Amino acid sequence: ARVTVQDAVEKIGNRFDLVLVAARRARQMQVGGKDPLVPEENDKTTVIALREIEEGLINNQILDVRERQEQQEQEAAEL
Amino acid sequence: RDVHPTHYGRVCPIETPEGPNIGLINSLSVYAQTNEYGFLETPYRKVTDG
Amino acid sequence: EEFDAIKIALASPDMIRSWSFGEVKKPETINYRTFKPERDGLFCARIFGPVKDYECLCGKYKRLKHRGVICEKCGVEVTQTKVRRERMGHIELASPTAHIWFLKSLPSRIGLLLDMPLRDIERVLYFESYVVIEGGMTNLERQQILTEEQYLDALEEFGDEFDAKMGAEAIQALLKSMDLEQECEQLREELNETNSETKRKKLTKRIKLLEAFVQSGNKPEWMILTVLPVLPPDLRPLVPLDGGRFATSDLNDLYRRVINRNNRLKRLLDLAAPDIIVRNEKRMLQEAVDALLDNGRRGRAITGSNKRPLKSLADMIKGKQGRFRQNLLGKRVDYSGRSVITVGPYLRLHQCGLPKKMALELFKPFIYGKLELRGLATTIKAAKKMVEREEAVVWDILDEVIREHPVLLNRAPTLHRLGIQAFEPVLIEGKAIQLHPLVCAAYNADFDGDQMAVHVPLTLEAQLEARALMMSTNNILSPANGEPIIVPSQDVVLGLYYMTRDCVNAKGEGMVLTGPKEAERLYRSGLASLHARVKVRITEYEKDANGELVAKTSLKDTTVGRAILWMIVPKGLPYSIVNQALGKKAISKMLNTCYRILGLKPTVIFADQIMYTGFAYAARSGASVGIDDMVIPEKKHEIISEAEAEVAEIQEQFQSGLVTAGERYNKVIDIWAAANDRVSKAMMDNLQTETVINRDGQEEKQVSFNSIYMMADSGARGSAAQIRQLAGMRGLMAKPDGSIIETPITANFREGLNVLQYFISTHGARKGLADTALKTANSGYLTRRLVDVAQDLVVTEDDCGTHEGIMMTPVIEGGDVKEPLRDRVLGRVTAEDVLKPGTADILVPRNTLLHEQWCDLLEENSVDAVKVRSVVSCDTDFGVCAHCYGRDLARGHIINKGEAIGVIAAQSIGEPGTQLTAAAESSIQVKNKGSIKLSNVKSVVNSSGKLVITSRNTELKLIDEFGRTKESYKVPYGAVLAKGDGEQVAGGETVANWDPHTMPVITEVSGFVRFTDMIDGQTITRQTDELTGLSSLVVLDSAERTAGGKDLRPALKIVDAQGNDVLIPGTDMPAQYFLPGKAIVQLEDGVQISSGDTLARIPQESGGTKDITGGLPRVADLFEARRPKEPAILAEISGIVSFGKETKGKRRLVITPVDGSDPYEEMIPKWRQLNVFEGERVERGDVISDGPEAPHDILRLRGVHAVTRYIVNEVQDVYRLQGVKINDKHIEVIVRQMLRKATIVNAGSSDFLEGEQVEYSRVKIANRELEANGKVGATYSRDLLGITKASLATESFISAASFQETTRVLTEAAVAGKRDELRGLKENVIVGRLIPAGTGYAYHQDRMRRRAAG
Amino acid sequence: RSPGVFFDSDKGKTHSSGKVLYNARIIPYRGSWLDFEFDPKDNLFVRID
Amino acid sequence: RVLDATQLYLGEIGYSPLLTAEEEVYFARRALRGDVASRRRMIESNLRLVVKIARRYGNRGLALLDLIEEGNLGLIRAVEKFDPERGFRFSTYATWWIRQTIERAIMNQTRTIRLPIHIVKELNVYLRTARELSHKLDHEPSAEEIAEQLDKPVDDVSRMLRLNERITSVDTPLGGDSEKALLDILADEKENGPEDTTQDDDMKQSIVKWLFELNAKQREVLARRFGLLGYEAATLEDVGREIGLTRERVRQIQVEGLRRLREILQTQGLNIEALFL
DNA sequence: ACGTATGCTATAATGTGTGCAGTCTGACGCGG
DNA sequence: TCCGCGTCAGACTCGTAGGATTATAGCATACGTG
Ligand SMILES: O=c1ccn([C@@H]2O[C@H](COP(=O)(O)OP(=O)(O)OP(=O)(O)O)[C@@H](O)[C@H]2O)c(=O)[nH]1
Ligand SMILES: [Mg+2]
Ligand SMILES: [Mg+2]
Ligand SMILES: [Zn+2]
């Protein structure tokens, strides 16, 4: 997680799409103030986003479902 | 730039920047001196009849 | 702000007026005391806007209360100073003026369009001669120049009916009258008649320019400027210095030259002055305009104050010092610092020392941020002061943000990607950066006073990018070669060698230990040496069939040192690897083994631990540099004293007059050369095994523990080559001319050089260090050249869906296999099903990666030749597939889609050359028994009874029991074979023998020698001796030859006893061997000869260490595709050879193919010898002549996979000579890019037609729609392009101007009216956008679906 | 370079001919240059400055 | 042939009349009465005289070609106002014009920063006085030494020497070798970097918080006076235009807003901390 | 009134020239 | 169209150092704004 990012690349595949998924999640915790899934243990967003991907909690499909699940709650509610 | 066998006694073979201004810049030899016209000249012990 | 494309078109006088916000009509910059703009001047605020943010000049309207208010008095708007660099101006030119970029920038452009030369146009401009615009009376036709005499003749005689004028006015009217529609059709008609090469070229280029000009919407009148734009004043500044001085750009000065002369012309047109004066004024005006656009071009550049030339407009867009290279692709960057680096031997791989006061300033906005969070700072200027006072609790906050934050460390120069690596900063008190020893290799960073730039990744993406891609742990192997660049060096290797290496008995021999821990116990207890043979019990962990590790415990007889090293060794490798004495070469395999087996993590750890123990134990050894360590052999004074008398013997023979000066010069070099190797080997023979004095019972022989040897043997520093100078003999030095001194240096560095021995050492020293400075630029310029062409290549598709590739064989050159097939065909997707010898069962699939483990089964089955899916065989339009490239050698598995290869490839090729800056081949000895197998050989038996070879490229194979090539040699021309073709030889037998310092000319027939065209004085010379009178004849070449015997070819003609010619067996060729220049001949006219006798001996002086200095140019020329001055002839199409007609020896060839009825003729020189001898079954592209192969000749005939195989072999040959390791796929990248454009041959559905040369990807996309719709196919023929040209070919003009020739690129792109839609990296890095590759590949393609969705 | 006269030869201006073309040049302390040079056809030429 | 604009014009003047004493009078007498052809000739003829006068007036401001053009304009004004009836020659009268027109045109197009004649005229006498002094003092004269010989002001001499200070181009090599110019050093005055930009943004956002933390009528009256929230920076007396309409109550409420705000800066950690600034 | 600008003077005088000249490999573009 | 000669295009990457010019008459009414 701090030294290694190979365990994180194992899960997704593309070194490039890993940085994009990890960044988007890092930004949700940085701005939205979302909760970390893994014990943060005094690490910055960078590392935590990798840990969730490394262990297998964060994914392209996972984050897209979760997004519109909060946004569809708003749809039904407004009108 | 290359060291020329004339340098012997006149100019130092090992005194020059190692930069692009390498072979152009050169220090004068220890006992080297200027010729009355302009060239360089070096001291030499004359040998008379051996 | 967010766009799609950038367009370039010609600036119409009407268009220039759109940008201009006023007309500068005065040169007045500012008032002298009141530092303010002048009335309609060059800094006018009424034209270019206000000075400060929202302030008029006189001061009537202030700040945003008067948002967009225009003042009455001064007439100045109240907007931001923003507009002072945005708002432009113009000048109404009294008389029209010509653009230098559409006149001088060749092609003429203005002259190319008019079908008019340069001289003609210029003499019109400078008012030397008039030019006809249109003659009503057909007496005078258009574009006919009339001298000042000839204008007057037509005036009174004809007049009026003819309209002709002078100056830039005339040529504009000529451009304004010419019809692009009609003169396009006229040229097309003349093309149908009788077309040649030059005629059709000229016509087609004009045709396309004419059509391009109409479709670009440009009008040829805009080539002449009626309106001249003015640059915004802020972009040509008049700003004051701190010292009360001012400073102005040279543009302002050049502008004042234009406006003054233009206003003086307005004044003279008011006075109706005589034309003679008006002429000067118009010439001047043009001089000023041309000097403003591009100063140094038409004539002398207008020099200014400090006798230097004024910097013009074009100059700020031109080359290195232009905006592109200097202020756009290269940038000074914030959150950046540099400092002296020093060692960090305590750090782990993923760590680096960062000074506190450095990181303090670097992370300034991150302190202010974390401060407001804790509530210590309420505002930022409060946080600013908290940092300034350097109070204690601010250090702890700085320390907080930096944790889990990577920093980029760069070293100059940035050769390859590894020139930057990311680490986790460790704050250290001190002004020095501390760098990790193992990655020192990648940077080439020596702690001798190196500095490394620091950079802070700001964005979270940059923190992830730095940790993911640019982290030191994620970057192990080189991208160039699949090899670990983080290999321990110097002390590390020496320390391990010391440990593993063993010695006789010593303390505690043959003891018995529980584990490798008891070995550390006893050594550090002082009851065992690291060099004690011991039977220890170690438990090794071997991998099984699955992922599970099997444990095995056994007694290994190894040393105390070897046992201790096992502690560092991860569990998964066998113990047999550390059971040997470890060296640099052995250690490099340990890490590679560790990598291919366990993975990444285990290696990083292993690599570090190897380094740490290496340094530690190297220091424990006590390894020093005493002067008794530099042992001179026993008998040096015995070798030299009698090797001197050897040379003194020949010296007395020369003055007698037998051995010539040249023969003595070569003969004395051979004596010294033997003595030098004699001293070298006696030295190491006394130094390597100096330890012959041991114990136990009486004696034993052992490796020497001489400090210097251990330091060389281990592979830590220096080598056998360096020790030679230290203890042995310095060797023979080289003159600055290139000739080698007859007398070398006898002494060494221990003994001391005399005064001259040092003077001699200088010559070699200064020239070696001169090529370190000067020759580095050619190699660094190559890196630049390679990159530009390979910018666009990125992995796009996953699978190109192609079943093509190129076959690969094992590099077995010079007996010992140079490069095995396993390594060559490693990490490359195959294109064909490759099984074992017995064709009855498949072993490896088609579309599969070759892992080192799959390549191990290639060894069991002994693969012959393999079709690997290559880069050039890719069908992916705009990029390549991951299958075609294969593994990313840097990573260690299949390449990611989106990774930008082209740049990785270019770097890999240029990196070694840039950092990288005994020919007694008498006889081949075969080593294993075999049957002799020659190929491409045509020999003839001689008088002696020996198979003499009369063919240039003869190869010699060594066939084993089952029938496969083991060893391979190059047998040269006129070589004497021991045994002919098919005969058995034993091991250690001289199969071939020849003279190296000579190239003989050997006959094929017997009889007498005739002299033809060998006149004394014209073609040859003559020199005789004494008593008898033996004369030698020396053939003069065009250099030493007079104009009399230039077309005379000198040759030694063969004749019989009668005097007639002797036919060469089975050919109608009378025997005639043409002697080249400087050919020494011993036999004079009228001498009997047998077949196989040497007629003449051509000298082969070749004693210059090629190194990299004289080997990089050859690489460049290959890439740049520059045809040699003696290319070899090849057959075009297959069929029947039929020799035809001749012209004073100049041979033709009337080839009549079997299917092809129409003959084909091509001409051949006389002196050049062929390989085929007529009437033969030739195929497409057979070797007819010998010499260098032209790259264009290869692809033209033998297709893509032939030219790719050539460049790859040819390039690698030069790098293999140096021990530079590059995968062929990296060269294949550049090759692919060199095959970008292709000439079209055949009319298609699109308006392609003939003579057009379009990109290969675009024309193939048209063929996609054609095979679906039918219509007419567009047949083609791929062309090869040099690097410099392949870069300027890409549709992107931005990428082309950013490279070079920037003055031309822009003008051609302006006239074409081309719009660049951006694909390359250079293109998006300029505009400062997301790179359409790597991290940004996922983003750019998400914008491409915005375009696709409607 | 010391003023006076100096004899040189481009060991192959045109490696086409490969002819060693010999040339002379008078170098003054102040003044115009005076060069003499041969050509592929060994015709003596003078090029002031 | 000839492709230098210099030699071409210099050729065309070389094939133009060279007039006699009585010829000049014949043409000039018709030139005043407007013969058209006559004015062209006298001019064409004496272009040769303009070039000889421009051979001494070079290396001062413009080029030789620039001096001839403006020297020709002097010959033209000399032809526009010559007196043929006078027995004196033309070459004499025309020289006074050609020397004048050149000097004047150099005085304008020589300096980038347009220096009018008045400040320049005087500067010359100060410089030409420096000659006299320099030769007899053998020491380059000071601002005082020039002032003591003319008996004129000290600041005048000094300020006139300040305008003689010439320019260095921002595109001038530093060290006589491709390295860096003055533009790669000289900074931008107008825009100060983010740190100075964010100073004011953060300082002025902190004030927006401090005003909403004051009284409703205290932050109304205090803000609209200084022009912080309002549109125009009013005075104690001018706050009465809005709703205040008071002179005493406005001054007590302005200062009441500032006193409560001074305690807000003492507690947040500025006051004397931000006093140095 | 103060600052800038335009103007005239009259021996005769009538065609300029200046300034670095071991760079070099490679590549076209007009004539011949 | 092919071969000689002219002009014109490049020249590995980052750090540091320091300085200076000549001269344009002389005086009297004409042109622009508080
Ligand atoms: O002009 C130069 C000279 C040298 N260098 C660079 O500086 C370094 C000087 O040479 P090093 O001291 O680094 O040499 P090395 O490690 O390759 O070999 P040894 O001394 O161990 O024999 C090398 O890495 C070289 O690339 C330049 O970049 N430019
Ligand atoms: Mg170093
Ligand atoms: Mg080193
Ligand atoms: Zn105003």
mmCIF file of N, CA, C and O in Angstrom, chain C residues 555-589:
data_model
loop_
_atom_site.group_PDB
_atom_site.id
_atom_site.type_symbol
_atom_site.label_atom_id
_atom_site.label_comp_id
_atom_site.label_asym_id
_atom_site.label_seq_id
_atom_site.Cartn_x
_atom_site.Cartn_y
_atom_site.Cartn_z
ATOM 1 N N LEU C 555 22.699 -31.351 4.359
ATOM 2 C CA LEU C 555 24.056 -30.827 4.661
ATOM 3 C C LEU C 555 24.696 -30.329 3.365
ATOM 4 O O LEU C 555 24.838 -31.123 2.415
ATOM 5 N N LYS C 556 25.053 -29.046 3.348
ATOM 6 C CA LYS C 556 25.796 -28.458 2.204
ATOM 7 C C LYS C 556 27.226 -28.137 2.639
ATOM 8 O O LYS C 556 27.399 -27.467 3.677
ATOM 9 N N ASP C 557 28.202 -28.610 1.868
ATOM 10 C CA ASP C 557 29.618 -28.260 2.139
ATOM 11 C C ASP C 557 29.918 -26.911 1.493
ATOM 12 O O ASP C 557 30.244 -26.901 0.298
ATOM 13 N N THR C 558 29.802 -25.827 2.263
ATOM 14 C CA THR C 558 30.121 -24.471 1.745
ATOM 15 C C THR C 558 30.914 -23.698 2.794
ATOM 16 O O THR C 558 31.311 -24.292 3.824
ATOM 17 N N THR C 559 31.155 -22.419 2.526
ATOM 18 C CA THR C 559 32.018 -21.669 3.464
ATOM 19 C C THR C 559 31.137 -20.964 4.477
ATOM 20 O O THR C 559 29.912 -21.000 4.324
ATOM 21 N N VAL C 560 31.790 -20.382 5.471
ATOM 22 C CA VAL C 560 31.115 -19.579 6.521
ATOM 23 C C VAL C 560 30.439 -18.383 5.854
ATOM 24 O O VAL C 560 29.287 -18.066 6.209
ATOM 25 N N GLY C 561 31.141 -17.750 4.912
ATOM 26 C CA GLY C 561 30.616 -16.585 4.181
ATOM 27 C C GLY C 561 29.379 -16.944 3.384
ATOM 28 O O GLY C 561 28.377 -16.209 3.488
ATOM 29 N N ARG C 562 29.454 -18.020 2.597
ATOM 30 C CA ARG C 562 28.296 -18.444 1.774
ATOM 31 C C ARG C 562 27.092 -18.655 2.685
ATOM 32 O O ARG C 562 25.983 -18.256 2.297
ATOM 33 N N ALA C 563 27.317 -19.234 3.864
ATOM 34 C CA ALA C 563 26.233 -19.576 4.810
ATOM 35 C C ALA C 563 25.531 -18.291 5.244
ATOM 36 O O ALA C 563 24.295 -18.245 5.234
ATOM 37 N N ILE C 564 26.321 -17.295 5.617
ATOM 38 C CA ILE C 564 25.800 -15.981 6.071
ATOM 39 C C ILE C 564 25.045 -15.306 4.936
ATOM 40 O O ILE C 564 24.098 -14.582 5.230
ATOM 41 N N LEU C 565 25.450 -15.529 3.691
ATOM 42 C CA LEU C 565 24.739 -14.816 2.599
ATOM 43 C C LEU C 565 23.341 -15.418 2.416
ATOM 44 O O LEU C 565 22.428 -14.684 1.984
ATOM 45 N N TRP C 566 23.192 -16.706 2.739
ATOM 46 C CA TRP C 566 21.898 -17.427 2.595
ATOM 47 C C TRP C 566 20.802 -16.713 3.404
ATOM 48 O O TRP C 566 19.610 -16.781 3.015
ATOM 49 N N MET C 567 21.206 -16.011 4.464
ATOM 50 C CA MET C 567 20.286 -15.285 5.381
ATOM 51 C C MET C 567 19.540 -14.187 4.615
ATOM 52 O O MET C 567 18.342 -13.938 4.901
ATOM 53 N N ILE C 568 20.241 -13.561 3.673
ATOM 54 C CA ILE C 568 19.699 -12.463 2.824
ATOM 55 C C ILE C 568 18.743 -13.071 1.795
ATOM 56 O O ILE C 568 17.713 -12.439 1.434
ATOM 57 N N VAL C 569 19.093 -14.272 1.346
ATOM 58 C CA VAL C 569 18.379 -14.989 0.256
ATOM 59 C C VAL C 569 16.961 -15.334 0.712
ATOM 60 O O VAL C 569 16.742 -16.019 1.710
ATOM 61 N N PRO C 570 15.947 -14.835 -0.022
ATOM 62 C CA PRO C 570 14.560 -15.209 0.236
ATOM 63 C C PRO C 570 14.345 -16.723 0.075
ATOM 64 O O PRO C 570 15.087 -17.374 -0.649
ATOM 65 N N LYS C 571 13.341 -17.252 0.772
ATOM 66 C CA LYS C 571 12.996 -18.690 0.630
ATOM 67 C C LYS C 571 12.108 -18.899 -0.598
ATOM 68 O O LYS C 571 10.917 -18.500 -0.572
ATOM 69 N N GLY C 572 12.697 -19.529 -1.617
ATOM 70 C CA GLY C 572 12.010 -19.899 -2.869
ATOM 71 C C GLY C 572 13.022 -20.271 -3.940
ATOM 72 O O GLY C 572 12.661 -21.004 -4.895
ATOM 73 N N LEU C 573 14.240 -19.746 -3.786
ATOM 74 C CA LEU C 573 15.382 -20.044 -4.680
ATOM 75 C C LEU C 573 16.165 -21.198 -4.070
ATOM 76 O O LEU C 573 16.159 -21.408 -2.858
ATOM 77 N N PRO C 574 16.822 -22.006 -4.919
ATOM 78 C CA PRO C 574 17.740 -23.039 -4.446
ATOM 79 C C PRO C 574 19.015 -22.477 -3.798
ATOM 80 O O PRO C 574 19.345 -21.322 -4.014
ATOM 81 N N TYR C 575 19.707 -23.314 -3.024
ATOM 82 C CA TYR C 575 20.917 -22.856 -2.294
ATOM 83 C C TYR C 575 22.125 -22.915 -3.224
ATOM 84 O O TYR C 575 23.103 -22.232 -2.938
ATOM 85 N N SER C 576 22.049 -23.744 -4.265
ATOM 86 C CA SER C 576 23.171 -23.943 -5.216
ATOM 87 C C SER C 576 23.586 -22.600 -5.823
ATOM 88 O O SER C 576 24.686 -22.522 -6.408
ATOM 89 N N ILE C 577 22.743 -21.579 -5.677
ATOM 90 C CA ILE C 577 23.038 -20.288 -6.365
ATOM 91 C C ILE C 577 24.080 -19.499 -5.568
ATOM 92 O O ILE C 577 24.897 -18.792 -6.185
ATOM 93 N N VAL C 578 24.029 -19.594 -4.243
ATOM 94 C CA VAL C 578 25.006 -18.895 -3.363
ATOM 95 C C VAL C 578 26.134 -19.855 -2.957
ATOM 96 O O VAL C 578 27.026 -19.449 -2.191
ATOM 97 N N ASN C 579 26.144 -21.068 -3.496
ATOM 98 C CA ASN C 579 27.160 -22.097 -3.165
ATOM 99 C C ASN C 579 28.449 -21.764 -3.927
ATOM 100 O O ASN C 579 29.525 -22.165 -3.468
ATOM 101 N N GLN C 580 28.337 -21.015 -5.023
ATOM 102 C CA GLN C 580 29.526 -20.586 -5.806
ATOM 103 C C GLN C 580 30.097 -19.300 -5.205
ATOM 104 O O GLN C 580 29.459 -18.753 -4.305
ATOM 105 N N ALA C 581 31.281 -18.889 -5.664
ATOM 106 C CA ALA C 581 31.850 -17.555 -5.375
ATOM 107 C C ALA C 581 31.095 -16.532 -6.221
ATOM 108 O O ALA C 581 31.073 -16.677 -7.454
ATOM 109 N N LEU C 582 30.462 -15.567 -5.563
ATOM 110 C CA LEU C 582 29.551 -14.636 -6.267
ATOM 111 C C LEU C 582 30.336 -13.436 -6.798
ATOM 112 O O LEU C 582 31.216 -12.900 -6.083
ATOM 113 N N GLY C 583 30.036 -13.093 -8.049
ATOM 114 C CA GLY C 583 30.626 -11.976 -8.802
ATOM 115 C C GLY C 583 29.526 -11.082 -9.338
ATOM 116 O O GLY C 583 28.353 -11.380 -9.087
ATOM 117 N N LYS C 584 29.875 -10.030 -10.074
ATOM 118 C CA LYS C 584 28.850 -9.111 -10.627
ATOM 119 C C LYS C 584 27.968 -9.903 -11.587
ATOM 120 O O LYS C 584 26.736 -9.719 -11.554
ATOM 121 N N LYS C 585 28.604 -10.755 -12.393
ATOM 122 C CA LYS C 585 27.887 -11.485 -13.462
ATOM 123 C C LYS C 585 26.971 -12.514 -12.793
ATOM 124 O O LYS C 585 25.833 -12.676 -13.276
ATOM 125 N N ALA C 586 27.415 -13.108 -11.678
ATOM 126 C CA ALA C 586 26.619 -14.138 -10.968
ATOM 127 C C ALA C 586 25.456 -13.468 -10.232
ATOM 128 O O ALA C 586 24.323 -13.978 -10.307
ATOM 129 N N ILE C 587 25.755 -12.350 -9.569
ATOM 130 C CA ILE C 587 24.774 -11.502 -8.831
ATOM 131 C C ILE C 587 23.669 -11.016 -9.776
ATOM 132 O O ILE C 587 22.509 -10.977 -9.363
ATOM 133 N N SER C 588 23.990 -10.639 -11.006
ATOM 134 C CA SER C 588 22.951 -10.144 -11.936
ATOM 135 C C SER C 588 21.921 -11.247 -12.177
ATOM 136 O O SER C 588 20.766 -10.896 -12.431
ATOM 137 N N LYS C 589 22.344 -12.513 -12.130
ATOM 138 C CA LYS C 589 21.424 -13.657 -12.346
ATOM 139 C C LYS C 589 20.619 -13.870 -11.068
ATOM 140 O O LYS C 589 19.487 -14.315 -11.176
#
